[PDB]
Symmetry: T
Subunit: 151 residues, 12 copies
């Protein structure tokens, strides 16, 4: 019966992942900037890469005993990340820079998670969970480099 702990949280990320997913395929479909060509391949290269993180993240669930979800009602509700309007351009000089301010929070979520995994004795979970932070961490670095350092 045990192991609901960090499990119910997988749905937390599992949910916010498919939201960053279609926003990505949104950055990717409407984009209209000078860099274009690239910012068209690299966005694809992201949602394509968090595409693989979404399936496995889902399979961690099944690993234990849980039965993953795929419903949408439970995405546009569970996620700690919201949709992007139909924008204005590719980049965004102000605070929220989606392309930049999106991976930033999930790193916190999982950051949060890992500890509980760093407790409940689920080295298997953290092995891949914390495998993703490395994953997502570079995609953070790379982006805030399209603008400017800081943090």
């Amino acid at each position: 019966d045990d192991l609901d702990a960090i499990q119910l949280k997988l749905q937390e990320l599992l949910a916010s992942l498919h939201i960053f997913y279609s926003n990505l395929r949104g950055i990717h479909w409407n984009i209209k900037d000078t860099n274009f060509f690239v910012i068209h391949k690299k966005t694809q290269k992201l949602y394509e890469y968090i595409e693989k993180i979404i399936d496995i993240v889902a399979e961690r669930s099944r690993m234990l005993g849980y039965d993953s979800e795929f419903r949408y009602s439970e995405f546009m509700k569970k996620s700690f990340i919201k949709e992007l309007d139909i924008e204005s351009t590719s980049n965004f000089l102000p605070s929220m820079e989606s392309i930049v301010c999106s991976l930033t929070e999930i790193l916190k979520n999982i950051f949060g998670m890992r500890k509980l995994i760093d407790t409940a004795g689920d080295y298997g979970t953290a092995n891949i969970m914390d495998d993703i932070m490395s994953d997502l961490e570079k995609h953070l670095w790379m982006h805030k480099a399209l603008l400017e350092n800081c943090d």
Copy 2:
């Protein structure tokens, strides 16, 4: 300004495609049948293939002048295809066989569409739209062969 005709309908399929998408990633994540191993690879092989149909279908929009959508509110509303509960098993002997009764309707939708394209003079649209029916038609055949012929 022209060309809203078959364009507004792309969103019709564009919408029902991402619904069959995550249902597929649902068949794919919970599945628990004897065939398993295979039906675990082939479902992936489907949503992976209608994944590519979803992006291009979206790019047909941008081809003309339209600006594609990626919002979810406009998927679980626009689509002529609904979500799957958390099922009961892989197959389903009764009428609706999702894995089978899903591709079946979009073929109609597009069937419908094509004519309007088969009129408005958008050979470019139909060249790929009707490129998909061939696409999806085999995936229909293949499935209703897991059960039985008919139609």
Copy 3:
């Protein structure tokens, strides 16, 4: 029940395809000419290519509802193309040049077909049927170039 129209005709080509098939593997096995080496690779490159056209052509049947045939009695009877004797050489200066005068007629058959498809509303059929004429058309051109233009 519908769709027997262009379906019963698939068997028409489906039949004449397996006849051009083994004639090809006949040109390919006995050939004894100067070009040889090549006319030995290219014949193979043909029957290997109409090999793939034969399977799919057969799968169009199953697409709809029909159940394809594979019997021989129904090939050496249905086909609008006949066998080659044990020849005399590779080329043939007179009218019928098999290697040349074979693809020529099926283009007519299908030519004929397409219209009925270009009517019954089977864009899926024509999409691949007329996909083959392009296919077979170059293999016509290429050959009548081993001899001389005309038509």
Copy 4:
């Protein structure tokens, strides 16, 4: 002039091979079973493999001095293997199991042959003839394992 011995027998197998060939492309086109997906790939994987055995077997002829055949009249007559009706299903619990009871006899034919080759001093023939028994022997094993051992 010599070497008609085992040569006239090549036509014996050469004939029964193209019969098992299209029956295979028959198992492959109509099949409608649960295993499906797999048994749809593996049947293809058979007739694709006895496809290569058919050409070379034909080229052994030309090796010596003989001129191979490709006519059909001489297949549905020479062969020691007959066509399959339009079946009833994929498997078959009774004696003749085509998918199983087909390779079984050619192994005898060739078995028979080899000796004559194992006499006339045609190590080149047997090197590949008996190369095929190994070939076909596993495809026998594999199949009667889909049902049950015995023999």
Copy 5:
């Protein structure tokens, strides 16, 4: 004798294709912009792709009976597309944007063509002709996205 119709027009596109060809290898050789590196690979990726469209377009001619041309006198005369001076930069804010305003017109030409093909009963011509519009249509979209939407 027939089929001069859409044939004489192939030379129309066949001509304007080799003009967009070397202009491309012109955009590609002198370019001096910030994007550079990318716009140096993507221009190459264009003329490399319309390179393949030029040969086949030429082979459609030979398909029928016509004998393609390769002379230059008949390019800088037949084409409905003109050469680029030695420019001023990569992009161009005003109306004509070559890199953008070039594919735009051939789409019309062929658009025009197709109908006549969409009449004379040359499904083989249209199958590839209209195969190119899809081709070239995306390269239009992609470009006018380096600047701004509209149309």
Copy 6:
């Protein structure tokens, strides 16, 4: 001299791994079920994968200072996993399902181990040891999905 701790335990898994190894090559050689074809490839895909886990696990030993073993006397004695009789079939509805109830225990063993590694300060050991649990964990999930969830 230090580091005998988790080292002597490597032999514990190192031993039970080569036992699951040949049992796998046992499931793989005698198997006779309906799924067959697949379950004949996937079993191979297992023992092939725990084949690589066996060598490296052995090389962790040499990493430190230890000299790995390869003797059999020390496998059919050290292992916490026993051999399979010559079975009865592929699957097994009762408790012990080898194909299923085998990976299950080593996960415990190592589970146990990791802690001691999660203490002695051998992050290098755990990095790969716990790299295997992820490894083996999916192969558990996958299997108990051929039957039914639970745990």
Copy 7:
């Protein structure tokens, strides 16, 4: 019922093969010599190659009717080849040179076998059995070349 002859002997080699197998993975794990790097890749290249000989050798059994074994009790008993202590070094100047004096005997065993196959009329067995002697013969040559010719 027949064919126990050379069959019961397959187990003879089948047994001694898995013994040379783990000794190899023993030479491969402890080795500590100057050549090292190589003598570390080539040993792997051996047991990796007799790994494939072990599976097929086992499948010859199933070819006929026999049901292969995988138990260890029946390896450290049936084999005509014994385990290696934990050695002293890589090479060995005296008579028994394992790395050298191991393949040497199985060549005899099989040598012996083949005749019985070279009698019972199992060309399929010998085709691969004697396929292995060529196999193993070079690995003999290669090794006794690391030391000195002779025989």
Copy 8:
């Protein structure tokens, strides 16, 4: 400012290269000979190879400071090689054998050039210029071997 010397001559070859280019795609499109198949691939294999020589030759210009041309007016004027009529056949027994008598002269041009490079101290130019003579020299040899030696 310097380096106009051998630079203005690059345009000399750069010009005659695009002329041999489309003549090649002319030999390649109309050809109608016995060798055909081969001479249809090898001509392609030429213009495809002098295609790469044309771009780099153009990039040598940009290397220094020059800005390459792509205009046609400056090809059918600058070149020391003229167009081919719509021929009569593939080969040509008399003096000028295009397929043969074309590479022959550019070897002279460049021959000429190199010296000036073999003077002005542009080892970088000659390194690739004289890289091309080796290039084109074999294509000379190969061709005059389709006819007869001499020179």
Copy 9:
């Protein structure tokens, strides 16, 4: 502002890595031993592999907020590893065996590091830092096997 802790230490390894780097390309360039050929490929295989460890290690810095260094003054000063003279031979029987006694210390450094990472809550750092110890640990093992075990 936080996270200077383990960050300032990355420069510690980042520094000693480029020192082992060119010493490697030193072992690699002067080497003159019997093993040669191998020890010429394997040394390359090392510095090529710690080449990738050097860039990422540098990118961990940028991950957080730090701006990596590349200056040399800060390598031949920061590093806890010194240069090799122009040696005497490939191997070295005494204590310091560079090729062996080099990876040995960085394992300590990082060993040291990890703890601080194993505290500050930088699972992302340790995930790759401790990913390297596994990395470098085998290269230690492998080497001290070219000589003798111990430790």
Copy 10:
């Protein structure tokens, strides 16, 4: 001491192989015919293939105990095949057709050999020796097909 029998004969073929070798690289270097291009690739494809037959044939020697030769004095003396003058053309209508009348005799030599192997109990020798006749037999067939059947 035994096994000089068929061994001294390997040198017989080993010798005549390197003679057909450089004659091939002679056919290959001077050739001047119409087929050219092909007959320039296929000759290469021969001597490249009998190149591999020459090394292994040599390694059969070392297999046993013999020490292969590589001297030339012992080729232009031992061989039962002689050099080609500097010819007159590619083909040759009369009896000896080298390109054709060369493989023809070695097939006899080995034919002869095999028996002695087919006696002395060297299944390993014959397995590859008779592996070559199949090899060389097709290259015979192929050639006498460039001219005419017969034998």
Copy 11:
């Protein structure tokens, strides 16, 4: 003893190459510009390419008799190229543009060298030395195209 001439100068370039090397891995690690993504791949694509130039350049030394260096003291002293501060941005509008003004001088150095090689009779040295100027020359062109032509 001879050949110190151009040899002592290899160290001149060999030295300045490893300086441009880590500056490159400096442009590559800190870069923060709009182009970013591209200029992050292309810089890597440079130092990766002058990485290969550095090793071979070093191996030219060993070619003759010299024993290459790898010490750093002898780089930050021998080189005619200096380190980059921790910059300000990616590009630089003023004179020295590193990314641009770096390859520029080594071309001179080597330019200088070649002559001495173009004298001492070391065609082997110049063959690769002047192989590099072509190398580096394009990387010059490409860069000064990111800004503006000139020279």
Copy 12:
């Protein structure tokens, strides 16, 4: 008629190349040393590489007008390199070290040649001739490194 100069000398190297060729396949077949495995691959890697040098060197002849030779009488006579006895071992501490003292002289021959090419105005010859010295020069360096530096 001209160009006999450096041409007659190609035969000089062309001759000594096929002698180093079979000596290589002699070092390669009898070798019996400790390094073995490596020195068995690297020797092959030499004669395989001077194999390609032999064909092209021969094609330089045909480039001009000359008709290459392939006779042996003209190798064991023309060459400035002699055969190796059946040796004593792999290495050789005294002066002549074949494996080492063989490439050494051809470098002189060609050295000699180049000048005459460095005169007669055959930049095409020298481009590849001096392409080989770089080739062979490294194979010199590598070998005299298996022993000791010097020269």
